[PDB]
Ligand binder design. Sequence first.
Ligand SMILES: [Cl-]
Ligand SMILES: [Cl-]
Ligand SMILES: [Mg+2]
Ligand SMILES: [Mg+2]
Ligand SMILES: [Mg+2]
Ligand SMILES: [Mg+2]
Ligand SMILES: [Mg+2]
Ligand SMILES: [Mg+2]
Ligand SMILES: [Mg+2]
Ligand SMILES: [Mg+2]
Ligand SMILES: [Mg+2]
Ligand code: NA
Ligand code: NA
Ligand code: NA
Ligand code: NA
Ligand code: NA
Ligand code: NA
Lengths: 186, 154, 140, 95, 156
Amino acid sequence: ATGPRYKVPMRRRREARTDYHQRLRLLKSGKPRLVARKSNKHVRAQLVTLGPNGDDTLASAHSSDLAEYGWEAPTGNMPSAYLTGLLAGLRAQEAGVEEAVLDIGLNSPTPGSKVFAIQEGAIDAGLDIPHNDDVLADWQRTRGAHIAEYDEQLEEPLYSGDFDAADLPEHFDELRETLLDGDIEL
Amino acid sequence: MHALVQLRGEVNMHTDIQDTLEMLNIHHVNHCTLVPETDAYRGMVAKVNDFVAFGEPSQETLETVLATRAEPLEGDADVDDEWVAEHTDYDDISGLAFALLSEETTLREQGLSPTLRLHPPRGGHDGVKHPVKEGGQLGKHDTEGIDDLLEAMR
Amino acid sequence: FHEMREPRIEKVVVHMGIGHANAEDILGEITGQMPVRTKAKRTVGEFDIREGDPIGAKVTLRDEMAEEFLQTALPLAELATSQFDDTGNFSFGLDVTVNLVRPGYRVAKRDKASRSIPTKHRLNPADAVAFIESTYDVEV
Amino acid sequence: PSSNGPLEGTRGKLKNKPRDRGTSPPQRAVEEFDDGEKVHLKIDPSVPNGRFHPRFDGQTGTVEGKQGDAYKVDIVDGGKEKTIIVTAAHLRRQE
Amino acid sequence: KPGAMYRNSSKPAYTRREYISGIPGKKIAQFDMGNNGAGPTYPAQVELVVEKPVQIRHNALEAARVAANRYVQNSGAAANYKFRIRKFPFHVIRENKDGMRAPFGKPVGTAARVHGANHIFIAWVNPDPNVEEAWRRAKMKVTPTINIDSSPAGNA
RNA sequence: UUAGGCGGCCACAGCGGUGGGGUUGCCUCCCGUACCCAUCCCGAACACGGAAGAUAAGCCCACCAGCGUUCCGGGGAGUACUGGAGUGCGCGAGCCUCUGGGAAACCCGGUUCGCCGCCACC
RNA sequence: AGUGCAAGAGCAAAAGAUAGCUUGACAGUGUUCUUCCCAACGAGGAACGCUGACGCGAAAGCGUGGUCUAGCGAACCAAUU
RNA sequence: CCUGUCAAACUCCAAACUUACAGACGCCGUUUGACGCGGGGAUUCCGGUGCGCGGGGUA
Ligand SMILES: [Cl-]
Ligand SMILES: [Cl-]
Ligand SMILES: [Mg+2]
Ligand SMILES: [Mg+2]
Ligand SMILES: [Mg+2]
Ligand SMILES: [Mg+2]
Ligand SMILES: [Mg+2]
Ligand SMILES: [Mg+2]
Ligand SMILES: [Mg+2]
Ligand SMILES: [Mg+2]
Ligand SMILES: [Mg+2]
Ligand code: NA
Ligand code: NA
Ligand code: NA
Ligand code: NA
Ligand code: NA
Ligand code: NA
């Protein structure tokens, strides 16, 4: 920028999207990465492998195409994340993928976070992934209990129209249950 | 195809230059060899450029020299039309000459020694301390230029 | 266009740059939340050679905590103009600084795909005076 | 030389041009080679580990097995056969 | 000491003051002479061109310059002309003043390296070339043979 | 790819600037703290929960060359330097010829305001 | 800028700073390079492994002292485990 | 802004050239056995000169 001697960062570093130091440590395993990403409204999970001209995504799942299986709830929450992880995990298994390492990009390793939920899902789908059980949420929160109880302090629906008034961690079970047998794209 | 004639001795000449002449089958002063005009061969003659005389000879001249100084891979045998015919693919010296010039074959391929051991130039040459452009006898020559040298060393 | 272009107060930093404290107490009551130590850098003649060393405190207030404070701070100040930032900030007073900016600031404060706010979208000294002046007082 | 350490006279070869300065791309530090492949040896100034003795910068050896994540490359120094322990970060496929 | 000892450019460039100390000051008084307030807005421009690469000790530079400018007072102390010596003595020179043991010499002076065909002096005059004479005297005190060259001046 | 995620090359992609775009796939800003989690003080950030509002930031799309960069034409320049050769020149420093290579600065005019891969997606 | 100390080199979501925690400055045994280009030669040094035991981290992983190149010592004898 | 100069321990640049590996031609080797391996015996470790590039030195 300033002159011939100036040093311009790698594009993905400028864009503040890729942590190259963590990337390298990740690639060390030689295993596929379970890319866990979030959006204000959605949660994505991809199983990426290394390629000659860039990464190769072998299996993925987005919180949006969750409805495609009977999801009638918001998609930016814990239960959402887990399921998206399980969905991607299953597709992953179908693709012949057996193991992977969790890549949470620029997110924080906070306990009970959604990326770990995504990791829990992928693991349950059958994917073998290096993890630590007590850094994950306590199932109930994954089910979405923390939100149901939050609506108990109602007075005004937590969900604008949406579905239900007191919400449903049960809807969660119905879905997980669904994903664990048959159905298309899995 | 160019005619190569060593005009300068081995004493004091770089070894990598002397080895090149040897890879081109010339191991003595006044010895001549025919070399295809290829990238590989071009580089070699360029490196030998200061101790040699080279250039494309005329059909006639090559014939004169082939007849006069060509030899079998082994032996005294004169390489005359009959020899050429009874030993090569061609029917006579002219046929062989043309093939060499058009770089279709080589002296070895036709059972001939790769070296035409010429005679010193009758009348003497233009000197081995300067190139042609300066009145000397070193370097690339004219077809008329080479012919004179080759004919004087017939 | 507007609504997302109109200024707002983002944190008000009240700090007492002492030279070695008991002062926190008043900051806590003047603001409403715990103060933070102020270590210093470099060794210097004001018998301030200690690198890591309490030498003052500060308090960053946000939202209501910031307004409810300025609703008494500002009144205790007169100044304006020249004493304003090139980014639409201003400090008066024990110091009390007011950082001002527009709606899309998080873009430059978050971790992922963060980015610097464009000069156009920055807050000018003038555009600042207006906002505040338009909130219980007068400029210059 | 006034000294005889490994980095003697390596001011040039172990320095980066101002623009190639900074952490290197991970792609090439994870590259995988097969036994028999020909690889060019060249230390990446930005990468600290997995290096080899600077005298070999420029060599082109033959990968022949590995040790840990490092590779074992066979080269010929002058007329002597040698084995170099080096990481992908400092290797490149020939051709 | 004779120029014979330093006029040749056969030694390495030796000018890094960060590794050399005790360098004698230069005897060259000025580099811009005449009306330096004015810019080259003159009709005629003559130059003194060195004809061989050599090393010119600051000694010779000063003597050469003085001898020329001191003479350019055929035009007067505040005359209308500007004189410029474009080279500076960057090359530090030594002398081994024990015999050939530990002979790296000690700094004794500086010199300027000039390559054949460069102009060491440039004067600017109105049609009044007394300067051509000022130079006959200047190349008199520097080692090489020289060429007095005129550039803007078709007023022959 | 009517806005996405992971990347490769790592400025041809930087710096600066103009114009355009969203009842929705969307991304954001945004709204909000019961929870998981969090600030040596602040739900600012991090984390979690969520859509009343917006396209003003970001982002995506189209474009501008003033600076920086990449490559090209013409000029500089077959100049500077240089591998090989010489009973060529020069008091010498050094130069010249033949042969094989061959630059940098700078000027003028073009180019460049990224390219490409995998996945997902009215 | 800083990174203990020459000089040169390396480093920015770090190899620097702050905080916290920790003792891998660990035992055993090797491969290789260096010492000694080429090309034989010891001590010493380094790189990279493995076996065992550990530290930290969600994890990939990192830790075979200090970002790299100086900071070193045979046989005999003694003391020590 | 304009204007005057430099670098063995400067570099936004940058040769000729030297150099690792591979293919091609050449030359060479398969009764003259190359490349290489193992063993016996040495001599040698005062060198000099020309040319090119040097560093020191008035030389
Ligand atoms: Cl994310
Ligand atoms: Cl090595
Ligand atoms: Mg015979
Ligand atoms: Mg006679
Ligand atoms: Mg004669
Ligand atoms: Mg060097
Ligand atoms: Mg807009
Ligand atoms: Mg280390
Ligand atoms: Mg003893
Ligand atoms: Mg003892
Ligand atoms: Mg060399
Ligand atoms: Na780098
Ligand atoms: Na003495
Ligand atoms: Na003279
Ligand atoms: Na403290
Ligand atoms: Na926008
Ligand atoms: Na050793």
